Design a protein around this ligand. Structure first.
Ligand SMILES: [Zn+2]
Ligand SMILES: [Zn+2]
Length: 72
């Protein structure tokens, strides 16, 4: 038997050495450091967090944050 795990075809031509250890992810980065910053999204509930004066509102997706930090 077999299944369809193809997924999205969204990608950008760029240099990427440090490969993500986590399986399936399939995400590599050039900046040896980037990786470290990436894993963050894997560990924990939400990597991004507003942390404003009196907001205390976090988010999982990036765009979500930026879109939320617009009304502030
Ligand atoms: Zn990953
Ligand atoms: Zn906020």
């Amino acid at each position: 038997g077999s299944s369809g795990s193809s997924g999205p075809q969204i990608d950008s031509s760029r240099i990427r050495s440090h490969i993500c250890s986590h399986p399936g992810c399939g995400k590599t980065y050039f900046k040896s450091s980037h990786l470290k910053a990436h894993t963050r999204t894997h560990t924990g509930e939400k990597p991004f967090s507003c942390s404003w004066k009196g907001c205390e509102r976090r988010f999982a997706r990036s765009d979500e944050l930026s879109r939320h930090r617009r009304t502030h």
